[PDB]
Design a binder for this molecule. Structure first.
Ligand SMILES: N[C@@H](Cc1cc(-c2ccc(Cl)cc2Cl)cc(CP(=O)(O)O)c1O)C(=O)O
Lengths: 274, 279
């Protein structure tokens, strides 16, 4: 009852995934600024114990202490955030973290999980633990104005842009019929994960990567051959729970309190800005 | 009649703008009817209900919500306090109206926070805000947590920066950054107007205030020289939300509707319509 299964996903800087040491523990280390890096064991893809740390892990720890629950963390098996798909036949089904939460394989999603109508139909989101939005990543020297650029709006195989498969951004483009032209360009090129897309830009096999700014601005800061556009859309990350969670109220109260007393400020400085 | 809803709001341009009721005894154009209990003098509880007309960013939201969630309302302006404060164990303002069941919802420039969330529920946020900084273009700072603010005597010349006191900005700063708070009291500004001129006339280097307010004024600056920091540096980020009664049967649909608006682009239209300025 009191022991929560936590699902999360690999997504620097919000979640880092590294191997355990020989003895199955995690190498102790400190942040650039001298804070102890808190680490947790997290099983994941066939499956094996690993080390997780980061913004969202720190947030999980503060939640676990504040509301007094214990936890066990694992990486989402299919590696995806979560979109809704028709089964084939009548039944629709969620994949990614969304499906694992809905199926009971997880009790709580702690991850840079975008809040949106689509998902909020079937689950309870907390108030945002992070406000951010969507922007575009390109190799330095690629000239693009943003989401309205003609090379984006009148697409061709001469300039390829893409997002992450079965993600909130995928939903965002599938959502509006006016973005139809953009989508079945993207659907042809979408990548299995944020990491593979970012890499594909550096390798010039991808011309523009459309994604969360809190991730993309971090990447551009560690990787100076990469740059971003301008937020063309605003959205937030929230904790994901099932409708019946007794935890939902206190999770949100905790997040609000953490915004107001500078705890989030601490996390944002440690992970998101450096 | 479970579908006609008492709804409370508060004048605060440009989220809520109050106007008189013109020629025909009816609210026209893009405005909606809203009543105000107008006091007889300043030393009395006596008053009179007066028919007013309301419009603005939050009123358009209310309009969009009413059509989508399918409800009707009698809109009224709160007269006992403003947004809401616990005073002698008692919530006043819009919050109180909701808490003591005079309103089903509060709509306006109402900040989502922990304390209020204890006694009311909030919708999802529909306007981002928090504590931000405004400077004259040129001046270099990051947000609140910049050392130039925290330890201003480490730099020469020391920054001069202030806020409008007695509100949630000062109270937040005093609870998180005691010395910075102590320091900036000598630079306090009586109003937002006086602060902007203080900035423009070099008597102030930085104005620390509500994010949503600062973006709006920056968008309207004569000369486009007053600029706010990047949104990534806003401190204690939060948003305006609609307050509902604890365990309200309406929250789910209001939430889903607001998220639909954002997803569909309608919200950006609205911010362009009401909040986006020329700068
Ligand atoms: N949102 C708040 C109310 C609230 C409103 C404003 C404001 C001021 C000028 C203009 Cl033109 C427009 C606005 Cl919206 C400013 C603050 C900032 P401060 O308190 O430090 O005075 C504030 O708190 C609440 O929900 O309690």
């Amino acid at each position: 009852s009191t022991r929560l299964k936590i699902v999360t996903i690999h997504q620097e800087p919000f979640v880092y995934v590294k191997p355990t040491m020989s003895d199955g523990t995690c190498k102790e280390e400190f942040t650039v600024n001298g804070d102890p890096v808190k680490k947790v064991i997290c099983t994941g893809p066939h499956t094996v114990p690993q080390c997780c740390y980061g913004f969202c892990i720190d947030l999980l720890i503060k939640l676990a202490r504040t509301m007094n629950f214990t936890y066990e963390v694992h990486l989402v098996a299919d590696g995806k955030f979560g979109t809704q798909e028709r089964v084939n036949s009548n039944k629709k089904e969620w994949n990614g973290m969304m499906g694992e939460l809905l199926s009971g394989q997880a009790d709580m999603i702690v991850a840079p999980l975008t809040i949106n109508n689509e998902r909020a139909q079937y689950i309870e989101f907390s108030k945002p633990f992070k406000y951010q939005g969507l922007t575009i990543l390109v190799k330095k020297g690629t000239r693009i104005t943003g989401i309205n650029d003609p090379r984006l709006r009148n697409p061709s195989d001469k300039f390829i842009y893409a997002t992450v498969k079965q993600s909130s951004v995928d939903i965002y483009f599938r959502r509006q019929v006016e973005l139809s032209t953009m989508y079945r360009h993207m659907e042809k090129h979408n990548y299995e994960s944020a990491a593979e897309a970012i890499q594909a830009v550096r390798d010039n096999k991808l011309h523009a990567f459309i994604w969360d700014s809190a991730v993309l601005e971090f990447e551009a800061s560690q990787k100076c051959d990469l740059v971003t556009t301008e937020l063309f859309f605003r959205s937030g990350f929230g904790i994901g729970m099932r409708k019946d969670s007794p935890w939902k109220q206190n999770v949100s109260l905790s997040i609000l309190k953490s915004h107001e007393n500078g705890f989030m400020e601490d996390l944002d400085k440690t992970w998101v800005r450096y | 009649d479970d579908n006609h809803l008492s709804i409370v709001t508060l004048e605060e341009a440009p989220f809520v703008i109050v106007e008189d009721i013109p020629l025909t005894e009816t609210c026209v154009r893009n405005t909606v009817p809203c009543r105000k209990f107008v006091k007889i003098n300043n030393s009395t509880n006596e008053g009179m209900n007066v028919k007013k007309c309301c419009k603005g960013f939050c009123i358009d939201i209310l309009k969009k919500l009413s059509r989508t969630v399918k409800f009707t309302y009698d809109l009224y302006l709160v007269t006992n306090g403003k947004h809401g404060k616990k005073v002698n164990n008692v919530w006043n303002g819009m919050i109180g109206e909701v808490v003591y069941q005079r309103a089903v919802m509060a709509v306006g420039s109402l900040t989502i926070n922990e304390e209020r969330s204890e006694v009311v529920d909030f919708s999802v946020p529909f306007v981002e805000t928090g504590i931000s900084v405004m400077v004259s273009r040129g001046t270099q700072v990051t947000g609140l947590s910049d050392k130039k603010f925290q330890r201003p005597h480490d730099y020469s010349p020391p920054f001069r920066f202030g806020t409008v006191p007695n509100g949630s900005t000062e109270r937040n700063i005093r609870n998180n950054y005691p010395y910075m708070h102590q320091y900036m009291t000598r630079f306090n500004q009586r109003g937002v107007e006086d602060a902007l001129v203080s900035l423009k006339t070099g008597k102030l280097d930085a104005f620390i205030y509500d994010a949503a307010v600062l973006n709006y004024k920056a968008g309207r600056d004569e000369g486009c020289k007053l600029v706010t920091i990047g949104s990534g540096y806003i401190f204690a980020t939060t948003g305006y939300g609609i307050a509902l009664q604890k365990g309200s049967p309406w929250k789910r649909q209001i939430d889903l509707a607001l998220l639909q608006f954002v997803g569909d682009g309608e919200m950006e239209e609205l911010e362009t319509l009401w909040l986006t300025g020329i700068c």
